[PDB]
Design a protein around this nucleic acid. Structure first.
Ligand SMILES: [Mg+2]
Length: 771
DNA sequence: TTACTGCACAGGTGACG
């Protein structure tokens, strides 16, 4: 029950003052709403980079209002571009904001200034460096050597409300991999060309920073490439001219024949940098480096020690102007009651409840294991038990002709053992995977023409696809294409598997004087485990056969997930306790955003179909956005439900609340708990327990959907949820985010960081790179 | 083993040839 955060108090905040001047944007009378807020935040962004001051937007009433720091001198007031031209008329009354005050609507304004001024002393520390604005600060000295790549340790620092009052700082340790030797002066024109879009650390003497390689310069370092007042000047001359005092040898003694790289400034100017001083950042998610990836996963005591060490070392004294700020060395710590996992309903009227008489950890591990063993027990089994509708297994011809038949028999038998009530009996069909070219077009040509023939009787299809490209930081457009077309042109519900991993599970054997394929079990996959996982996720879940549901009601009657990526939106809906789950994909005119009319269309359609099966009149709705919510999306959701309350489809006083689920948090905070110190663990720091939670604010909370009993290595990463709108209390929203993350359907015996609502969003999108 | 779970990065935007 004893929890420590990575929130540190801020001292000397008194006498620190932040003066702004509200302007209002004449803009265009016509508000495309979605285009209106894009242009506002575009200008706020443009202004911040060009004048280097903490510009902010204050969206109240008219939602305009650009806040200009009072200390900037000449201010254009009128600004070009931005479609129609905009003008800013100051709203008078210049604001001098204090940090000892109660909660205002100007707290977003205070947080922007606080963030901005706090990283000035750090940016001036000769032993630290920052890749770019807003990023963590790293030590210049590498932490670890790692044999041709260097490992750098850094810490993020972000301003945040303090739950006991006032303001503070939330921090987390970060890791970065940079190759040890520079790109080099002797690297030729073609080799530099092969680095476009890669990112490098540039050691410009004592000023280190990161940039993206855009092009290769036509001019070497000692040849004139720019001019310093008419006269042509080499890059070598420019770096000598802007060095100070005791400049390092490396920036005044550059190889004249070396090449230079080119990058774009955040105001879109072009600059050059000598390849002799540039060190490639290892995108480790782009090129599989798993021995590296382990270096990034920290034990709780390592993670707590690195963060606190940075605090006591660089934020003890902090001068911003004539201000003396300190970050206290002791993080905020608290006592709380921890949420227990919810009671669950399985087959045959069987409930699973956490045992309240055992100690918490033993009780959590028993509960979690039992989610798997109850699902498998033919005396209890799946909550939803029924025969499947007809099914199809669509295999490449090359596979059907080799190990396909052996895989299918094993796979069929695995489904029937996992879901005995289903009678799984698929028709096995093939497509000509070698007749048209093996790329994405050509594979799709063969898949569509099997479809066009009508060989896919039955509406459900599981199709085995070939892998085109690896690199886990890419996009598999073939699976998205197949799902898109089969859904749109035929009426099919499609699930996908790939052919590389199951094929590794079979080896050819000579038996009774005939070649046969049998299971193997060396290295490449664990084929028995693969068959069970695919059986649950692709056939059972893909037919909406839910293994277990919540016994008791959530705080919300209905919660809806929303994610938009790649011009494809997903809407998920969970009602009853997961007895009613729905997923609609729909195309979107913007890459990552939704029109107001589209939110209200899809949601009134989705809910209306289901309302006659919701036998409780509905009076609390919650929307879970993956990431930031946009005002037209908030508006489209408030309209949907104000409408339904007037028809009588829903309680006449039902209310909606919108929460942003920030899985990559702008203020990532950690929680730790404690234990008897023990040789290996001299400070006794351990992960928090599964149900731990903390609110900072009426608008910001954290729940551990992952934690102590169920984690193998590393430290739990608490899920940040933020209230965008609505009456519901953040504590109530955190509780049923937690209950929804206990519906661990893809892997029953496990913890799962995302609630089922946006978990369904990640499954269904997989970044839909077509339509 | 990407059938699947965690942790990692992902987030946050002022610099700087
Ligand atoms: Mg993180």
């Amino acid at each position: 029950m004893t929890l420590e955060t990575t929130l540190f108090p801020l001292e000397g905040l008194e006498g620190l003052t932040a003066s702004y001047q509200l302007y209002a944007v004449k803009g265009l009378s016509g508000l495309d709403e979605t285009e209106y807020h894009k242009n506002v935040n575009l200008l706020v962004r443009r202004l911040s980079f060009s004048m280097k001051a903490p510009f902010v937007a204050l969206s109240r009433d008219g939602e305009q209002f650009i806040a200009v720091p009072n200390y900037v001198t000449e201010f254009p007031v009128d600004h070009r571009v931005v479609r129609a031209m905009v003008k800013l008329v100051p709203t008078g009354e210049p604001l001098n904001l204090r940090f000892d005050a109660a909660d205002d609507e100007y707290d977003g304004l205070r947080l922007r200034y606080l963030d901005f001024v706090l990283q000035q002393p750090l940016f001036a520390n000769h032993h630290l460096w920052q890749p770019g604005s807003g990023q963590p600060f790293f030590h210049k000295k590498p932490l670890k050597r790692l044999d041709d790549v260097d490992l750098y340790d850094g810490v993020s620092v972000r301003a945040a409300k303090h739950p006991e009052g006032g303001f503070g700082i939330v921090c987390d340790a970060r890791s970065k991999f940079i190759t040890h030797t520079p790109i080099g002066a002797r690297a030729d024109r073609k080799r530099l060309g092969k680095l476009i879009n890669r990112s490098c650390l540039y050691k410009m003497g004592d000023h280190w920073y990161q940039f993206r390689i855009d092009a290769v310069s036509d001019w070497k370092v000692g040849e004139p490439s720019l001019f310093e007042g008419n006269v042509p000047i080499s890059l070598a001359q420019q770096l000598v001219r802007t060095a100070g005092n005791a400049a390092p040898k490396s920036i005044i003694d550059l190889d004249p024949e070396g090449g230079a790289l080119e990058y774009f400034t955040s105001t879109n100017e072009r600059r050059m940098a000598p390849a002799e001083l540039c060190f490639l950042i290892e995108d480790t998610h782009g090129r599989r480096a798993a021995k590296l990836q382990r270096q990034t996963i920290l034990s709780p005591s390592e993670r707590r020690a690195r963060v606190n060490g940075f605090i006591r070392r660089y934020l003890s004294e902090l001068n911003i102007g004539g201000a003396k700020l300190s970050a206290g060395a002791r993080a905020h710590a608290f006592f709380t009651e921890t949420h227990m996992p919810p009671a669950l309903s399985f087959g045959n009227g069987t409930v699973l409840a956490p045992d309240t008489s055992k100690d918490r950890f033993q009780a959590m591990q028993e509960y979690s294991s039992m989610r798997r063993t109850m699902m498998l027990d033919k005396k209890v089994g799946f909550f939803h038990q029924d025969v499947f509708p007809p099914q199809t297994l669509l295999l490449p011809e090359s596979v059907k002709k080799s190990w396909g038949p052996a895989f299918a028999s094993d796979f069929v038998g695995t489904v029937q053992e996992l879901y005995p009530a289903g009678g799984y009996r698929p028709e096995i069909i093939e497509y000509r995977d070698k007749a048209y070219g093996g790329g994405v077009p050509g594979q799709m040509k063969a898949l569509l023409e099997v479809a066009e023939r009508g060989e896919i009787k039955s509406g459900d299809v599981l199709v085995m696809l070939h892998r085109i490209n690896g690199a886990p930081r890419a996009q598999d457009k073939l699976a998205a294409m197949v799902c898109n077309e089969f859904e749109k042109r035929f009426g099919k519900r499609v699930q996908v598997i790939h052919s590389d991993s199951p094929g590794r599970g079979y080896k050819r054997i000579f038996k009774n004087d005939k070649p046969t394929y049998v299971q193997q079990r060396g290295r490449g996959v664990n084929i028995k485990g693969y068959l069970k996982g695919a059986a649950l996720n692709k056939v059972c879940l893909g037919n909406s056969r839910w293994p277990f549901v919540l016994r008791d009601p959530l705080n919300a009657d209905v919660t809806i997930g929303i994610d938009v990526k790649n011009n494809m939106a997903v809407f998920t809906m969970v009602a009853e306790g997961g007895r009613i789950v729905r997923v609609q994909r729909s195309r979107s005119r913007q890459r990552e955003q939704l029109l107001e009319s589209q939110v209200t269309q899809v949601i009134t359609e989705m809910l209306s179909k289901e309302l006659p099966e919701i036998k409780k009149q509905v009076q609390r709705v919650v929307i879970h956005r993956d990431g930031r919510a946009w005002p037209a999306e908030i508006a489209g959701a408030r309209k949907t439900f104000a409408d339904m309350a007037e028809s009588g489809l829903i309680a006449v006083d039902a209310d909606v609340s919108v929460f942003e689920v920030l899985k990559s948090s702008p203020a990532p905070l950690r929680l730790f708990s404690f234990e008897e110190p023990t040789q290996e663990n001299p400070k006794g720091v351990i992960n928090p327990v599964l149900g731990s939670w903390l609110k900072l604010s009426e608008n910001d909370g954290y729940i551990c959907t992952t934690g102590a009993p169920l984690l193998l290595q590393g430290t739990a990463d608490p899920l940040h949820v933020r209230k965008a709108f609505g009456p519901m209390a953040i504590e109530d929203a955190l509780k049923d985010v937690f209950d929804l993350s206990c519906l661990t359907w893809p892997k029953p015996d496990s913890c799962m960081r995302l609630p089922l609502t946006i978990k369904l969003c990640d499954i269904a999108l997989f970044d839909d790179a077509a339509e």
